[PDB]
Design a protein around this motif. Structure first.
Motif, PDB file in Angstrom:
ATOM      1  N   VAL K   3      81.939 -53.044  -1.455  1.00  0.00           N
ATOM      2  CA  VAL K   3      80.749 -53.341  -2.046  1.00  0.00           C
ATOM      3  C   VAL K   3      79.875 -53.072  -0.667  1.00  0.00           C
ATOM      4  O   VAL K   3      80.011 -53.909   0.221  1.00  0.00           O
ATOM      5  N   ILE K   4      78.981 -52.144  -0.833  1.00  0.00           N
ATOM      6  CA  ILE K   4      78.195 -51.778   0.528  1.00  0.00           C
ATOM      7  C   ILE K   4      76.776 -52.718   0.429  1.00  0.00           C
ATOM      8  O   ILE K   4      76.349 -53.070   1.632  1.00  0.00           O
ATOM      9  N   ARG K   5      76.251 -52.990  -0.581  1.00  0.00           N
ATOM     10  CA  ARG K   5      74.938 -53.742  -0.766  1.00  0.00           C
ATOM     11  C   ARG K   5      74.601 -54.269  -2.095  1.00  0.00           C
ATOM     12  O   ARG K   5      75.078 -53.529  -3.177  1.00  0.00           O
ATOM     13  N   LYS K   6      73.926 -55.494  -2.217  1.00  0.00           N
ATOM     14  CA  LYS K   6      73.373 -55.761  -3.427  1.00  0.00           C
ATOM     15  C   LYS K   6      72.035 -56.337  -3.181  1.00  0.00           C
ATOM     16  O   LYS K   6      71.686 -56.885  -2.326  1.00  0.00           O
ATOM     17  N   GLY K   7      71.274 -56.049  -4.000  1.00  0.00           N
ATOM     18  CA  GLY K   7      69.734 -56.497  -3.945  1.00  0.00           C
ATOM     19  C   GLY K   7      69.063 -55.960  -5.158  1.00  0.00           C
ATOM     20  O   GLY K   7      69.407 -54.939  -5.793  1.00  0.00           O
ATOM     21  N   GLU K  31      81.925 -45.826  -4.502  1.00  0.00           N
ATOM     22  CA  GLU K  31      82.154 -44.845  -5.658  1.00  0.00           C
ATOM     23  C   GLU K  31      81.125 -45.216  -6.695  1.00  0.00           C
ATOM     24  O   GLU K  31      81.044 -43.971  -7.421  1.00  0.00           O
ATOM     25  N   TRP K  99      67.402 -49.255   2.292  1.00  0.00           N
ATOM     26  CA  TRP K  99      68.331 -48.771   1.054  1.00  0.00           C
ATOM     27  C   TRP K  99      68.760 -47.388   1.736  1.00  0.00           C
ATOM     28  O   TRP K  99      69.811 -46.879   0.997  1.00  0.00           O
ATOM     29  N   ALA K 101      69.442 -46.148   4.130  1.00  0.00           N
ATOM     30  CA  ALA K 101      70.695 -46.167   5.174  1.00  0.00           C
ATOM     31  C   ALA K 101      72.045 -46.639   4.445  1.00  0.00           C
ATOM     32  O   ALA K 101      73.012 -46.066   4.550  1.00  0.00           O
ATOM     33  N   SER K 102      71.776 -47.596   3.571  1.00  0.00           N
ATOM     34  CA  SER K 102      72.979 -48.143   2.684  1.00  0.00           C
ATOM     35  C   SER K 102      73.683 -46.701   1.729  1.00  0.00           C
ATOM     36  O   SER K 102      74.558 -46.872   1.655  1.00  0.00           O
ATOM     37  N   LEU K 104      73.381 -43.856   2.547  1.00  0.00           N
ATOM     38  CA  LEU K 104      74.184 -42.952   3.636  1.00  0.00           C
ATOM     39  C   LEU K 104      75.658 -43.199   3.560  1.00  0.00           C
ATOM     40  O   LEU K 104      76.590 -42.313   3.578  1.00  0.00           O
ATOM     41  N   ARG K 105      75.693 -44.639   3.660  1.00  0.00           N
ATOM     42  CA  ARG K 105      77.187 -45.219   3.956  1.00  0.00           C
ATOM     43  C   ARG K 105      77.904 -44.976   2.766  1.00  0.00           C
ATOM     44  O   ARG K 105      79.283 -44.799   2.824  1.00  0.00           O
TER      45      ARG K 105
END
Lengths: 111, 111, 111, 111, 111, 111, 111, 111, 111, 111, 111, 111, 111, 111, 111, 111
Positions: K3-7, K31, K99, K101-102, K104-105
């Motif tokens: 998980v890259i991010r949650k918000g 994914e 976001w 930046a996130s 891009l990942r």
């Protein structure tokens, strides 16, 4: 409580000889930063208030590409237990700047 | 015999290629410093006399946050076996200063 | 789960009915603070949880001309039995500072 | 190292000066037998090594009409303090047999 | 053939990403230096002729205490395969000087 | 358990009745010092424990114009059989220094 | 499509806290650079176009012998995801120069 | 609540293909039988009421010495989830009879 | 004391759920049978007197080829702790008959 | 690598010049057969490879009225030194059968 | 899988028929990108694959005076249902950059 | 066991009877050098052991104006079939240098 | 020598307590059956002559589906070392019958 | 954490305002019961905790002539939104029994 | 295609010596039964048509509680590869009957 | 990935232009069927995928009075080059049955 962001971060200065570095699942709110063992959040490791916290960059490595930033208490010598600062490591510069912007929403400004 | 302190410390310069660093359980008395495999103290690794020992700081790392201090024999070139000094690593500066104060009670003063 | 420190400390405020000021063997972990009759740990007098435990100083009175600090519960009035605070004494000031550092590692912060 | 059993048992031979016959929380491992004030294990009254410890029966006296067995040291006269033998009592005979079986697993054989 | 010395040494620059460093059992003769998987010598890794080899010190680390010295071919750019030099690591300075003296008997002199 | 060094050494003080000064294959570990007839290790002449073993120098006598050092037991009069000290000789002085370093690693300190 | 070269390379700046470095099987063509889990090529990790890519040397380490070179996009700030450059590590200088020559055939020239 | 007994038992029919058998720390009271991951009791797996439970022997094995007994609900087809009975394994016959006697105190009688 | 035989044997009925079976290094003398963790004999597990011991065959398996024989005390219900008999497993019938003959020299005859 | 058996055996054919028939401590592994002066294994007299080693019987002569068997090399004339065969003797016939079984496990078959 | 991010994010282009512009809880992995009603993740509104997903800016219109960016599929006309692009809004510009930046990942690159 | 490199190379000296100079897919490991019809590796033409294989240059002849190097066996006259040396050609000089480096890693040294 | 068949088989009765069962790579010729650690055949475990060998079925299991057949020497009690027969296990009945047919070509007929 | 079952089920009691009786894709784990629009799991309608959830039967009414069962919360009045019970329907009776068994494994017991 | 059920099952007769039993994620449709490595379904192991398949019970074990049922082709001797039947294991009888009912919907009836 | 079988087989239908009927070394894995010139595997003639490969019988013709079977592709007309089917011959009928069994394990079913 409103959650600002959730994501993985590596605690760079807490452990070492005990067990490498290891990554923790962080949950940042406007009142505190908490980290758990994983995203299931069924096992909390600690909850740190964001009061009196500021942020600063830390250049270290010269072996393996890594980017560090730390949280420190301006009214105390130790931000957490007997640690002067909480060093958080990210994989890229992009991710660090991404997290910095999130901390900004919680009132954690750079030194 | 009166025990001054017991706690875990990491031996930073004894092992390396053999097996990382590993932590040992130390027992400091007014006569000697002994280290065992664990706090059950059922398996001793070595007992070092504190006679002619002094202590000094050692700055090294620049990769992972660590704090080192070493014990050395002033009347000998090697404090233990063929090691010039016994490098002990702690997690924080607080813990190092904490141990230094304990060594002071055993007559081990800084260089 | 890890043992932070083991060492002798003097409980400066024991009621004469039990005996008076005595020296006990303390075991400090990240979760509890226990004290035994001696270092063989055959008799455990009590075990306090380090949660909501804080530390403060006790003034060096002429009669009890020693160095003392105390532990108290922020939620409870009595930390242990009928004692409002647990007073721990040491021969020197360096020993108090040493233990304070160890307490920080356990989360017990000063007042 | 493994805990064989934990359960309440009554020490039938405590001197009135301390209080009298009382019920304590016993912890039996392959190496030691410990008893605490209660099941929270905050206060450990004593810890006996299971080495050279044997068990024998105590006759059901009219006054102490209960089921009792005792532990004694084959090398020492007093097992614990000034007691020649530790008398443990149970409500029923089935409970005594149960504990005897647990003691066998620890090596404590009958006389 | 006369064996000069047998002992463990760590090959510091051959492997890395493949599998750390690992230690090898070395056998030095007046004609060659061979290294095996272990002291049973039932599995040889390589045999290096000492012809045209010289030795030199190498300062590197600043993280974990280590002492390095390397063998290099003066008539070639690569002493072994595509490696410029064969870096051998020892635990102490004493051990390095000990091995240097052994190499001296094989005609391997410092640069 | 680890083998520190293997190499040929000359026992300078063997009684003529057995043969005289001879060269044997030595195996030095952190626990024992053994010597065999040759490097195939089919015949082990003896094995000494490195505990309470120390090393001292033997003066270069005109007749035995070689470099010699000796091992002796601090607790016993005879280290091996009826010998007050085991005299080990080497062709050069550099070889003696080399072995001394190896002995340090095993705990055998000089007198 | 014509394959220029296939071989193992270590990605030095992608992973770290996630799982060391690890080696990947690379396949370079005149149109792109792809890396898989292994030489069976049954599990592709990524395919990077060589368009607008240039190559440059990177000096880092001072602990373990390693040689690095990186691919970077001249028309972008991030060559792949949020990574500024793709750092590839080889065991020797020979291997790096060997790969550089291969990249030359794909139109990837040094900065 | 009064605890009758605490000890390790192996659940013989719950898991298998999932992960062998594994031992659990059991806590039997007059009202229920609970099992946890270990004696720290910080992670409970399940709490089973003793109401309507009976006990019976089970002969199975003929490969490795083992002794089994099971708890079953007389008013239900499944004592726990979709399991007909809860099979508990002990190392010896003594231990099984020891536990049976304990269950007797909780009102769990044999079939 | 005269040692009759030393060799590895598998204890078939002591452990199971705790940790498979595992092999132990046995040392049989005319007075007792002792087993250690390994042939270094630096860690003893138990010493069993051969007094009142007899031996008997045990047919069990039908899954993996194994041959068992057990030692039992004729004057007791449990030969060791709460175990009725000590089941020892060998790989072949030859090895069992080989060990039986050895036990014969210690006065342990078949039932 | 595994030790098959250790036990005392009598070498029935030692030349008087060395002493005569003596009892030695034998160590049998799958690769070698070694014999020491005693069970402390400080002095290893010899070590034979079990390859091409066979066993045959030696007739119970009136003078040497004991039970004997012998080992010989099928490729060599002398198995050990100038001996055409190594004669091992035992007090009883059961002991010979026992050792024969152990030899089978090592591959040493009868003639 | 990670998980890259949650918000929380605001979907600025929801049809009034469904309600209008609303705030949803986003979960970004390497994914997929999923959005739930709230942070308890009990109701998942949709899940988009990050493949062929790109991001572009949306001009700050007077009415919708906020900071917005959008996701679109390069292969499809509609990314989600009948929407040509998914418009995500944030209170500040710093949050949009964060976001991005996130994203891009996760591989979602800008247009 | 590890694959050093895979790439197309031209065998410059194939007899016309078989076809003439052709391009084949080469696989170089630390133990063998194999060449297939193409990169699908369905047809392996031959496999040479890298032992006793060396490399030398072949002069750029006007007719065969390309860059060539050759492999030969130092022990045999013919490396492959009836060929005294295997001639490998490349379009540019940079490609030859590249392969030479790869050959060094396999132990194939120049003449 | 002509190889009849090569394939994996499980040795069912050689090992057990030492290390499960494990599979070996077998190579059957008209003269012998050899087994190695793996199909690289670089580490041979044993070579068994097919002279005087016969084959027979063995029904055992009743736990996990398995099919066994064994080779035995008709002129000896032990076909290999101290094993009465060599039990080979296959996954299916088809595979056993497949191997039986192969053994037929080597002159190994069923009992 | 483990998924117990996945399969289509019909929610027999959905309010017409939302659509009416519909078929959804159910995912049952030991902790939750979730239902999605379809088997691609892109849209999760809801997720119920299996705690305090029980199951009962629903009578086969002429109009809704199908086989139905229902889930309800023993602590709450409404299990999901404003529904007193969740009615799940299946084509056949065998399918209901099948799901009931799966529910038992999750702890959801019948009323 | 309509999926009837998804869940974990243990393949009891395919593997054994290769690697225990292991569980697979099964997906049953009206046309076929497929099994994958896990519920992510990103790695399929096999797809078996349900045509001509029937089901039957299999009693085996007597060691560890297990319940087996198998699928077999009535028009063939081997249902899959060289296996006579596909043995599927469940933890309880309830789960087996649950799966049987599911197979019924696919036209797989009991023998 | 696992090798199912290796053995010699005769290709009964090779065109005279290439030579005629010849014997080749076959390697059968679960994924491919390869044939080499001989058992050293230096020259691989071809490699066929076992997918869509089936087997059928070839009638024993007077001229080619041997036992033959053939492999063919169900999707393609030619399995290998211009051959409609690959004919494999064996000396006896038992050998054909043996290979058929091995082919089943690879999925190659009969027609």
């Amino acid at each position: 409580i409103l959650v600002i962001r959730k994501g993985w971060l590596t605690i760079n200065n807490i452990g070492i000889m005990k067990g490498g570095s290891k990554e923790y699942w962080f949950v940042l709110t406007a009142e505190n930063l908490s980290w758990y063992k994983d995203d299931e959040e069924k096992e909390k490791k600690y909850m740190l208030s964001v009061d009196n916290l500021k942020l600063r960059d830390v250049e270290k490595g010269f072996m393996s590409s890594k980017h560090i930033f730390a949280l420190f208490n301006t009214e105390q010598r130790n931000v957490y237990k007997d640690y002067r600062q909480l060093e958080l490591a990210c994989e890229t510069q992009e991710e660090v700047d991404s997290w910095k912007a999130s901390f900004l929403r919680a009132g954690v400004y750079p030194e």
